[PDB]
Amino acid sequence: PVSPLKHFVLAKKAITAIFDQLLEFVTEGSHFVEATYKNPELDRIATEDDLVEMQGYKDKLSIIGEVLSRRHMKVAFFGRTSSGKSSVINAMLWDKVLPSGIGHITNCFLSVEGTDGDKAYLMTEGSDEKKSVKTVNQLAHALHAGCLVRVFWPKAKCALLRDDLVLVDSPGTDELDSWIDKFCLDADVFVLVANSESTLMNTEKHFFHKVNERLSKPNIFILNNRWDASASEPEYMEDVRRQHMERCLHFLVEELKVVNALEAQNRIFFVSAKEVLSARKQKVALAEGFHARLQEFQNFEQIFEECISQSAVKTKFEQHTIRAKQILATVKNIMDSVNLAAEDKRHYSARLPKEIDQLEKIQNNSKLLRNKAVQLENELENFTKQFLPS
Ligand SMILES: Nc1nc2c(ncn2[C@@H]2O[C@H](COP(=O)(O)OP(=O)(O)OP(=O)(O)O)[C@@H](O)[C@H]2O)c(=O)[nH]1
Ligand SMILES: [Mg+2]
Ligand SMILES: [Zn+2]
């Protein structure tokens, strides 16, 4: 039962390894191009612009590797006040990481990410201080288009955080474009948490219309929470479920048009975050239907993990994969140009045996480097076949 999130972890490892190799190769290639261009006994075998191109690639490949090394999956939770957003997050983390109450903050966000340490802490904006998580409920938020508070929870205690997932908790939806710009541009999945004792509201729909306008084919899940409230009323529950399904299906399929009606079955769930957290927190007869609701939450979790791991690998690693392929194609063109100029010179105007031998060594080293580029192209093609479907 391997978590689907390992797909993202393995992709991240693979592409960072390629970019480590690419920086090493381009550095070696740049030294060769530089030596060839700067040789006073050679004329226009390598050009000044060949060297400028190689040096420019060299100078930007380290930051690509560093950016890749921090890439992660992000899920953002939205919904009306008291719908259960924080409890859904806590259930997925197997602990009461986030508190309840304090629902008055109208514009500030909270994220949870993994720490390699063994103690939880938080950090506020523009600060490096590791503050006790028990101060979450005391942060003033006076002046605040709000702020982000970052919670760090030991990776050893939650597999999701170990596998590079970050979870974002939001204020109640009841300028929004500022929310999208500041928190949503790199979110891979959006989760709408709704009170199943109510009805899906237009204020929540409106926010996801804005997301859908700003982003292409966003991944959206709807969790109809507090489903324990109709336990022991199975006939009533059946009818409420039908009504919720009709409205949630129409929203995802007909209004947002982000899934077809079959796909939507894997995006709408009926759960009790309270029950799930109680079952998972370490250290009375269960309500009717408890195990069925727990299984439904576990089904959501599996489908969510599959969705976010596939989506984030494409969203976050494809552009630099395509860029690496372009860089390699250009480096090969430079090696082709150097080899061709050396061979032309050898056959057109080279005279002394020592000059001929010098040109032949330039040819040989340019081919060694070109073959290295081809091998890295093969690694990127393998990465594309494994991790980047059309
Ligand atoms: N019966 C029941 N209560 C729940 C469930 N999920 C959350 N609650 C309760 O509803 C209240 C609100 O829970 P939260 O998880 O804090 O909801 P929220 O959306 O984060 O609320 P705010 O951040 O204050 O807007 C808490 O008292 C929870 O115990 C559930 O599945 N079933
Ligand atoms: Mg909350
Ligand atoms: Zn704030």
CA angle 75, 278, 120 (to 5 degrees): 55
- Measured from the alpha carbon of residue 272, the closest ligand is 1
Q: Return the closest-CA partner of residue 22 out of 281, 298, 378.
A: 378
Tell me the sheet residues that pair with 347. none
SS3 149: strand
Same structural domain, 355 and 279: no
**What gap in Å lies between CA 269 and CA 222, rounded to an integer?**
6
Atom 12 (ligand 1) nearest CA: 82
Residues pairing with 78 in the sheet: 192
Distance CA 192, CA 314 (A): 23
Query: By alpha-carbon position, which residue is closest to atom 23 of ligand 1?
Result: 103
DSSP 266: T
Q: Is the CB of 173 under 6 A from ligand 1?
A: no
- Pocket probe for ligand 1: among 80, 81, 82, 277, the residue whose CB has the most ligand atoms within 8 Å is 82
Residues 6+ apart with CB under 8 A from 326: none
80 CB under 6 A from ligand 1? Answer: no
Task: Indicate if ligand 1 lies below 6 Å from the C-beta of 224.
Answer: no
- Whether 99 lines ligand 1, by a CB cut-off of 6 Å, is no
- Residue that terminates a domain, selected from 274, 291, 316: 316
Q: Which ligand sits nearest to residue 100's alpha carbon?
A: 1
* In a shared domain, residues 154 and 277: yes
Give whole-number Cα distances, 27 to 32, 56, 239, 359, in Å: 9, 11, 66, 22
Q: Please tell me whether residues 310 and 354 are part of one structural domain.
A: no
Together in a domain, 305 and 376: no
3-state secondary structure of 272: coil
Query: For atom 32 of ligand 1, which residue has the closest CA?
Result: 226
Experimental method: X-ray
Binding positions are 82-87, 225-228, 272, 274
- Which atom of ligand 1 is the closest one to the Cα of 193? 19
CB 279 less than 6 A from any atom of ligand 1? no
E strand map for the chain? 73-78, 109-115, 121-123, 148-154, 165-169, 189-195, 219-225, 268-270
Q: Do 166 and 236 have their domain in common?
A: yes
Documented resolution in Å: 1.6
Cα dihedral 45→49→54→57 (10° resolution)? -160
Domain boundary residue, one of 269, 290, 316? 316
Return the bridge partners of 75, or none: 167, 189
Instruction: Please give the number of the atom of ligand 1 that sits closest to the Cα of 88.
Output: 15
Instruction: Report whether residue 386 contacts ligand 1, using a CB cutoff of 6 Å.
Output: no
**Is the separation of the CB atoms in 224 and 244 below 8 Å?**
yes
| Same domain flag for 101 and 165 | yes
- Full domain range(s) for residue 234: 72-316
Which residue in 248, 250, 313 sits closest to 68, CA to CA? Answer: 313
Indicate whether 257 and 194 sit together in one domain. yes
Count structural domains, the chain.
2
> Does the beta carbon of 171 sit less than 6 angstroms from any atom of ligand 1?
no
Name the one residue in this structure whose structure tokens are 């109450």: 101
Residue 127 Cβ contacting ligand 1 at under 6 Å: no
CA of 102, closest atom in ligand 1? 24
Q: What is the DSSP string of 297-345?
A: HHHHHHHHHHHHHHHHHHHHHHHHHHHHHHHHHHHHHHHHHHHHHHHHH
Alpha-carbon separation of residue 361 from 24, 40, 143, 331, 354 (angstroms):
21, 16, 68, 18, 11
55 and 108 together in one domain: no
Q: Which ligand does the CA of 173 lie closest to?
A: 1
Q: Is 81 in the pocket of ligand 1 (CB under 6 A)?
A: yes
Q: Which of 80, 89, 90, 100 to mutate to test the pocket of ligand 1 (most atoms within 8 A of CB)?
A: 100
**Could you tell me which residues are annotated as the binding site for GTP?**
82-87, 225-228, 272, 274
Residue 286 and residue 194 in one domain: yes
Residue with CA nearest ligand 1 atom 14: 84
Q: What DSSP state is assigned to residue 352?
A: S
| Contact (Cβ atoms closer than 8 angstroms) between residue 366 and residue 339 | yes
Is residue 80 located within the same domain as residue 50? no
* Domain boundary pick from 289, 316, 343: 316
Q: Give me 265's structure tokens.
A: 């079955």
Q: Does residue 226's CB lie within 6 angstroms of at least one atom of ligand 1?
A: yes
Q: 52 and 145 share a domain?
A: no
Residue minimizing CA distance to atom 27 of ligand 1:
100
- The values of phi and psi at residue 57, to 5°, are -60, -45
111 and 259 housed in the same domain: yes
Distance CA 45, CA 36 (A): 7
Does the C-beta of 273 come closer than 6 Å to ligand 1? yes
In the block, which residue shows the tokens 């523009």? Answer: 126
